[PDB]
Design an enzyme around this catalytic site. Structure first.
Site, PDB file in Angstrom:
ATOM      1  CG  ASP A   5      32.146  31.026  41.438  1.00 39.21           C
ATOM      2  OD1 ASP A   5      32.457  31.459  39.921  1.00 39.21           O
ATOM      3  OD2 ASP A   5      30.962  29.955  41.508  1.00 39.21           O
ATOM      4  CG  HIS A  12      37.323  31.461  39.552  1.00 35.40           C
ATOM      5  ND1 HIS A  12      36.698  32.807  39.708  1.00 35.40           N
ATOM      6  CD2 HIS A  12      36.281  30.297  39.428  1.00 35.40           C
ATOM      7  CE1 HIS A  12      35.708  32.431  39.971  1.00 35.40           C
ATOM      8  NE2 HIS A  12      34.924  31.318  40.081  1.00 35.40           N
TER       9      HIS A  12
END
Lengths: 297, 294
Positions: free
Chosen positions: B107, B274
């Site tokens: 991320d 994710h």
């Protein structure tokens, strides 16, 4: 809350979808005025007197806004789609005996209005849309610059309860920040403080805030799909149309609005007004004149 | 707060922009692990032990995140640009005597990592990026579908104090909803509750949330412009690189994208949302160990 419409009556109009609140004044040909977000019918208070010199003026709260009833939404946000809102306001106007009328809308109410013209053109003698392009055009134009500029289209459309829970901590700050942000000056000076208080009191109700989010969810999904069908079919609004927008408003951001509306309407005129988004409050004299001129002969 | 790194030390590393907190464990070649939003270094707690079997593992809080110091921002969000964060982390690694190291990021931390690779490739032996594409690519892809999916890139980048004000009412809800909504399961069940509490406690601090917003403001502005220069110049990462992504993740054709940005890249999907290191720790650890071992 102040009475901002001297001499106008007040009606609560029954429809199958719930009551529509409206102020009613004037005399002459019927003219419906529809507000948008985060406002109520009172946004028309600076232009309604001049319009009521020439028209029977009906100043309505949208379904779920202001003092209108709030239907329960559903998984497709149906009651707050512009198609459903248009059907509901057609029923409301029929309760008054108006089956063919003039219509001016601003922001969400302008989206109700052009959707009404696409679905039921026979209802409208003439149509005016204030500081908008079609919902399909805003989404087709989303890129990085416009995603930053109209972030609220994607924020308020997130699945519940995310926007509702973010708006609940300090609702006054958000509604007042949106009102200020979209004006030319970037503050609240363009608004009558009594009108701001109407907007603030409406926005202080969590049920009203949920309706607003459902409106933007419809705007991201069914409303976009309804528009997509029309543009891909080449359907154009045949009703004589006026597009007005603020030179510092949202519609002009990255698009030349009259060219856009000519793709959507076969008899359209347009003009900018020196104003941010809130034309009837930031530029009441120019807006009232444009509307009086267009709707008259 | 629970100690989720058994055997790892805890270190505050000095830099010209403030302290970087890190957990440090293992021995062998140096490997820096960088978290993202809305997490802290603790997101590596399920894969760091396996990595520390073969590497000296440095698990750092990003500049302004977690227990790292918060440098004062400015009108261009400079200290929270990935270019500046990478410079700061290069300084921190020099304090440990690491001038050539392996790096894996997730991320926001993966954005630090590829920007570090573009600006200072000599610092890196190998690079891994988890569930991202370059910031330029995200923005170039910003149509209706993506504006809805990654709305927070535009919401958190709005001028202060708009997101700061909205996040203050119920921060616990927001951080938890982010954690959950980006997983395959759609709830918090893939996370260790003690890890969630680390993330909640950090997000509960308004100063920490302001940093996060400055990170997304940098992501909308200077980070995008830095990436645009490299694209427009045809600049590619020369560092051997691995791109991992979640089959149910955000980045989702990622190896094709990265091959436009990197001259030596391999890649693979992981059945995961994710949060690869927490949702799929076994496959993530195996892929990282194999890649960094050579």
């Amino acid at each position: 809350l102040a009475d901002l419409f001297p001499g106008f009556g007040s009606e609560w109009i029954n429809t199958s979808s719930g009551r529509i609140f409206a102020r009613v004044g004037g005399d002459g040909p019927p003219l419906l005025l529809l507000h948008g977000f985060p406002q109520t019918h009172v946004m028309w208070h600076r232009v309604a007197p001049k319009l009521a010199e020439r028209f029977k003026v009906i100043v309505a709260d949208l379904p779920g806004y202001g003092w209108s009833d709030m239907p329960e939404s559903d998984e497709q946000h149906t009651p707050y789609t512009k198609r459903a809102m248009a059907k509901q306001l057609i029923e409301a106007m029929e309760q008054l005996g108006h089956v063919h009328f003039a219509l001016a809308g601003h922001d969400r109410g302008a989206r109700v209005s052009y959707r009404l013209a696409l679905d039921s053109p026979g209802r409208l003698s003439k149509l005016a849309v204030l500081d908008i392009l079609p919902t399909y055009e805003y989404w087709q134009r989303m890129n990085r610059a416009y995603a930053l500029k109209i972030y609220h289209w994607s924020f308020l459309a997130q699945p519940a309860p995310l926007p509702e829970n973010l708006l609940g901590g300090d609702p006054d700050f958000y509604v007042k920040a949106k009102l200020a942000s979209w004006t030319r000056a970037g503050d609240l000076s363009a608004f009558d403080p009594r009108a701001v208080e109407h907007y603030r009191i409406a926005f202080a109700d969590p049920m009203r805030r949920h309706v607003m989010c459902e409106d933007f969810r419809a705007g991201a999904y069914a409303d976009f799909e309804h528009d997509k069908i029309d543009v891909e079919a080449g359907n154009k609004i045949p009703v004589p149309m006026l597009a007005l927008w603020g030179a510092s408003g949202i519609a002009q951001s990255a698009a030349t609005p009259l060219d856009v509306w000519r793709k959507w309407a076969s008899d359209v005129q347009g003009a900018p007004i020196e104003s941010g988004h809130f034309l009837p409050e930031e530029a009441p004299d120019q807006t009232a004149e444009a509307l009086v001129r267009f709707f008259s002969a």
